[PDB]
Amino acid sequence: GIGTGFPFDPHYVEVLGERMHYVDVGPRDGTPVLFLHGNPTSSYVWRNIIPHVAPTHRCIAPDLIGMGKSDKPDLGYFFDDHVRFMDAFIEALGLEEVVLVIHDWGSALGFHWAKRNPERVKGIAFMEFIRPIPTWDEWPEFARETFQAFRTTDVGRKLIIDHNVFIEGTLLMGVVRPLTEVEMDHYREPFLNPVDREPLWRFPNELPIAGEPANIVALVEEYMDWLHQSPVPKLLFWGTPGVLIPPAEAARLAKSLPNCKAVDIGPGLNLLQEDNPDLIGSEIARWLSTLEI
């Protein structure tokens, strides 16, 4: 069965005066592979994928600020806050050239960093990633009223902050197979106190949907314009029915994006890592062996 443990040695680095936790396994040299999680996860989401890559490549998986085992400063946890901390995390580790493996809000971080620093990105593997959702009709109908409610300071904070709905409900509605109690306890651990749930609420309020927020829509449009032209090697994982990326969106991206290979993982919603980790890990490792890294 799918692994529930998190065996990785903890590593911590000071970033802008705060401690960030990260996984760091595999060989010390070579080009490192940087894994970026999203909402409401942590490096735990990569726990069954990294073991396929670590035999041949260094794997670095940070917990975003305010998440996982990273510190919890009193921030708004806007996307811009995550950009500042992730930019500084990369520099604090002395990383030069990297391969990115990115998902959900980790994909917005990774694509935005890659567009700004294309000389340092030797490949991008991505899945269920952030793109502009032009209208609410392009958000999945089964989740539409709830994401609209999440994007308010009254109803949305009651759901996400007071009642932890992004962890207890949305997370499960983002995985096809059932999560176990042990897995749920790993996902719950950073958010036992309601006040620590700010990033879980700010993230859906940053999603670029129906033109709002305009600043995020613009930033995401910019990195998508880059991705449609850049020769950077690309590996796209997708599932059915998906959430952010429906199968039809995925198949077209695969042929439109330069130097891109697409991989169908089977049934999947948002956290594709929880539905088919072994295929995602083995395909990343195979694809890495084809790169000039």
Give the angle 102-152-238 at the CA atoms, nearest 5°.
Answer: 25
CB of 106 to Cl ion, least distance (A): 11
Which of 26/204 has CB closer to Cl ion? 204
Q: CB-wise, 39 or 276, nearer to Cl ion?
A: 39
147 lies in the binding site for Cl ion (CB under 5 A): no
How far is residue 275's CA from residue 191's CA, in Å, rounded to a whole number?
23
- Structural element, H or E, at residue 87: helix 79-92
**Separation between Cα atoms, residue 227 and residue 256, nearest integer Å:** 10
At 165, phi and psi to the nearest 5?
A: -65, -30
Say how many residues touch Cl ion, by CB under 5 A. Answer: 3
**Shortest spacing between CB 182 and Cl ion, in angstroms:** 24
Q: How far apart are the C-alpha atoms of 282 and 293, rounded to whole Å?
A: 18
Binds Cl ion by CB under 5 A, chosen from 106, 204, 233, 268: 204
Nearer to Cl ion, 31 or 39 (CB): 39
The pair of structure tokens assigned to 107 is 């994909």
Contact window for Cl ion (CB under 5 A) among 20-28, 76-84, 199-207, 263-271: 199-207
Annotate 138-169 with b (16+ C-beta within 10 A) or e (fewer). ebbeebeebbbbbbeeeebbebbbeebbbbee
- Examine residue 203 and tell whether it contacts Cl ion (CB under 5 A): yes
Residue 39, interface with Cl ion (CB under 5 A)? yes
Piece in contact with Cl ion (CB under 5 A), picked from 3-11, 35-43, 217-225, 258-266: 35-43
Q: Which span sits near Cl ion by CB under 5 A: 3-11, 39-47, 50-58, 85-93?
A: 39-47
Q: How far is the CB of 45 from Cl ion (least distance, A)?
A: 14
| Shortest distance, position 120 Cβ to Cl ion, whole Å | 27
Residue (31 or 41) nearer to Cl ion, CB = 41
CA distance 22 to 12: 6
- Residue 83 DSSP code: H
Q: Which residues bind Cl ion (CB under 5 A)?
A: 39, 203-204
